[PDB]
């Protein structure tokens, strides 16, 4: 319990690597943002065990350090952090300020040992959390940090409806697909068969052709996160105006 020292030391080592990246992201976002309203941003971390199988654990923590601190440097607004997998956990509320101690707490509580990746359950729950905070005060943004694999165990129709429900609630969603280059297969190489007719050859399409999120970026290297994510946020800012 007092071994929060281990988590704090680990977060500090992440800040050493990601400090220049977080400043480049802050600056690039500032340039885009000038081109009275308040912003509410939620960072969602995939806590499922496939993150260990796909070696996206480091990318997940590096991305949280880069993004969470850049938004704090930019003074955009309130940041919430959630974890999902077998259940939804609110690790950092909107009204509390996001600090280094907040990052250490998320590091200690995310062990990537959950046995499910219930993304539909997550999306359905965050709408209530966003809607309660819209009325407390605004532009709302959800960033999903996940390997983006094994997302259809709840059913494709349910997952697609959950993404559609977030949009209907005026929540802008960007999926940050973590794709480790060291891994045997890239998410771009996963395929999906389409059948039609008895005994006829199936059509082999790419798995990403049925990705349930229309707005996404692919992140192989955290060094590319400032340039890629700030470009992606152009669409959110333009829609808000």
């Amino acid at each position: 319990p007092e071994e929060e020292k281990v988590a704090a030391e680990m977060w500090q080592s992440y800040l050493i690597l990601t400090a220049p990246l977080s400043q480049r992201l802050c600056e690039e976002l500032r340039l885009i943002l000038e081109g009275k309203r308040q912003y509410q941003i939620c960072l969602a971390i995939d806590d499922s065990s496939s993150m260990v199988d796909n070696h996206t654990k480091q990318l997940a923590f590096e991305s949280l350090a880069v993004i969470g601190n850049a938004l704090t440097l930019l003074e955009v607004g309130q940041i919430a952090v959630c974890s999902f997998g077998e259940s939804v956990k609110l690790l950092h509320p909107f009204h509390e300020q996001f600090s280094d101690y907040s990052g250490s707490q998320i590091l200690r509580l995310c062990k990537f040992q959950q046995k499910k990746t219930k993304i539909a359950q997550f999306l359905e729950s965050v709408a209530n959390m966003f809607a309660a905070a819209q009325q407390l005060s605004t532009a709302q943004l959800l960033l999903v940090v996940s390997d983006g694999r094994g997302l259809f165990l709840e059913g494709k129709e349910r997952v697609l409806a959950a993404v559609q429900a977030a949009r209907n609630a005026n929540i802008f969603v960007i999926f940050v697909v973590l794709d480790n280059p060291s891994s045997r297969d890239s998410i771009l190489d996963i395929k999906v068969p389409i059948f039609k007719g008895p005994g006829e050859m199936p059509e082999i399409r790419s798995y990403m052709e049925e990705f349930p999120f229309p707005y996404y970026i692919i992140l192989r290297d955290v060094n590319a996160l400032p340039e890629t994510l700030s470009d992606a946020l152009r669409q959110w800012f333009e829609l808000v105006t």
């Binding site: 499922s48 065990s49 496939s50 199988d53 046995k115 499910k116 990746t117 694999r149 094994g150 259809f152 165990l153 709840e154 059913g155 494709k156 129709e157 349910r158 297969d185 190489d189 996963i190 395929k191 999906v192 068969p193 059948f195 005994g199 006829e200 050859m201 199936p202 082999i204 798995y207 049925e210």
Partner: protein
């Protein structure tokens, strides 16, 4: 369109050689449809008849039916072993 389970699947030899990249597949997929996907990956003039196994249990009617009798870790990519069907005597 449906709310059936889908999951990632990887084909491989009895000897462990992987065939192609992982596949996203509905859990009610039949051995007949697994044969058609396998025919695509092997790209042979005449496809051999194949049998399919997950954790040493043969898929006879559907992938989901076979998994119902197993305690599988759903987060992992499911390995599907294929082997040619037997040829009988005389």
């Amino acid at each position: 369109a449906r709310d059936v389970q889908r999951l990632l699947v990887q084909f491989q030899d009895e000897g462990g050689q992987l065939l192609g990249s992982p596949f996203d597949v509905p859990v009610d997929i039949t051995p007949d449809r697994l044969q058609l996907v396998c025919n695509a990956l092997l790209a042979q003039e005449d496809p051999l008849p194949l049998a399919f196994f997950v954790h040493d249990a043969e898929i006879v009617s559907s992938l989901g039916k076979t998994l119902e009798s197993q305690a599988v870790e759903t987060e992992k990519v499911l390995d599907i072993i294929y082997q040619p069907q037997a040829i009988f005597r005389v």
